[PDB]
Amino acid sequence: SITENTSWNKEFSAEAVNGVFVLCKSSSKSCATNDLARASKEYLPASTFKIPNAIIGLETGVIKNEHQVFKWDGKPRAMKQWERDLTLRGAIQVSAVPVFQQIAREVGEVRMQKYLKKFSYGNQNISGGIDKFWLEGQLRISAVNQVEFLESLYLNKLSASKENQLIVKEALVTEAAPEYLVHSKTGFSGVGTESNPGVAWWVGWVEKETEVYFFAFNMDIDNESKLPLRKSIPTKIMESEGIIG
C-alpha cells in the first residue's frame, strides 16, 4: 500500500514543520508519503470531523435535508464569520463549531458511537463530552485513515444513504473548473503548548480529467501564524506532482 517519498520533506524542512502528507492516486491501495511513521499516527480531527458529523446529522434526521438553514440567535460566538445564518455548506466551509456542537448533542452519544463504528473512524473514542470529543477530547484519527474515509465517501460506500453522501460532497467543493474539481476540509485544534502543540489539517480529494487523487495532511502547530502551511505545503507538493491543476 504505502511508499516513502523523501523529496517531499523539502517543503516541511523549509518551514521547520513537523507534519505528514499522504497522497493516493486512484485509490487508497497506492499511497505515498513524506513520513512513513507519522502517516498512521493519530491526532484530534478538529473541524475535519464536520465531514462525518454532517453525514451522521443527515442520516439521523437531526439535519432535515440539504436546504436546512442554521440560524444565528444573535448571541456572541467565538468567530465573527459564524455570527449569521448559515446553510449546511456554509457552516462546513466557515467551520462553524457551535452549529456542529448542537448537531452532535442532538445526535447523541449512542448514535454517534454507532456511526463511527460503521465509518471505521480512527480510534472511535468519543469520551470528553458529546459536544467536544473531536476538539479536545479523546478522538484521534491518522492521515491514512482520513484518506480511507474520504475514498469511501467519494465512492458513496459509507454506511449512509447515497443521497446524504452526495449532499455532503457538494458541501465540500472548494475549487471548480471545467476539468478540475477539488473537495477539501481544513482542521485546527488550537496552538496547544510548545511541549504539546495543536494539530492542523487539510484533507480532501482532487478530480482531474478522469483521474482522482486522495490527500490528507497534518502538522504540529504551536503558532497560529503557521496555519496557512496546512494548505500551502500540500499544494506545492501536488503542484510538483503535476496534479495542481
Q: Is 86 in the site for a copy of itself (CB under 8 A)?
A: yes
Helix segments in the chain, DSSP class H: 9-14, 36-39, 50-59, 88-93, 97-107, 109-118, 143-155, 162-172, 229-240
Q: Is 67 in the site for a copy of itself (CB under 8 A)?
A: yes
Grid coordinates given for 60? 439521523
Q: Is 194 in the site for a copy of itself (CB under 8 A)?
A: no
Query: Binding to a copy of itself (CB under 8 A): which residues in 196-225?
Result: 207, 209-210
Select from 241, 245, 222 the least CA-distant residue to 19. Answer: 222
Tell me the closest approach of the beta carbon of residue 134 to ligand LCE, in angstroms. Answer: 8
6 is in an annotated binding site: no
Tell me the closest approach of the beta carbon of residue 199 to ligand LCE, in angstroms. Answer: 9
- Comparing every residue's Cβ against ligand LCE, the nearest one is 47
Q: Which is nearer to a copy of itself, 197 or 204 (CB)?
A: 204
Question: Of 179, 195, 196, 225, which lies in the binding site for a copy of itself, with binding defined by CB under 8 A?
Answer: 179
Active-site residue (options: 47, 142, 184, 189): 47
- The three-point CA angle 93-94-95 to 5° equals 90
Q: Which is nearer to ligand LCE, 34 or 95 (CB)?
A: 95
Chain residues binding ligand LCE by CB under 6 A are: 46-47, 95, 97, 135, 186-188
Q: Which is nearer to ligand LCE, 115 or 217 (CB)?
A: 217
Question: Of 110, 178, 194, 225, which lies in the binding site for a copy of itself, with binding defined by CB under 8 A?
Answer: 178
> In angstroms, rounded to a whole number, what is the distance separating the alpha carbons of residues 214 and 111?
28
Binding partner of residue 97 among ligand LCE, a copy of itself, none, CB cut-off 5 to 8 Å per kind: ligand LCE
Q: Which is nearer to ligand LCE, 39 or 135 (CB)?
A: 135
Q: What is the dihedral of CA 70, 76, 82, 83, to 10 degrees?
A: 80
What is the DSSP track for 119-175?
TT-TT----S-TTTTTTTSS--B-HHHHHHHHHHHHHT-SSS-HHHHHHHHHHHEEE
Task: Mark whether 26 is an active-site residue.
Answer: no
95 is in an annotated binding site: yes
> In angstroms, rounded to a whole number, what is the distance separating the alpha carbons of residues 51 and 70?
17
210 is in an annotated binding site: no
Is 46 in contact with 189 (CB distance < 8 Å)?
yes
230 is in an annotated binding site: yes
Q: Is 87 in the site for a copy of itself (CB under 8 A)?
A: yes
Contacts of residue 205, Cβ cutoff 8 Å, sequence gap at least 6: 150, 151, 154, 182, 183, 184, 212, 213, 214, 215
Catalytically active residues are: 47
Annotated binding site for a beta-lactam: 95, 186, 188, 230
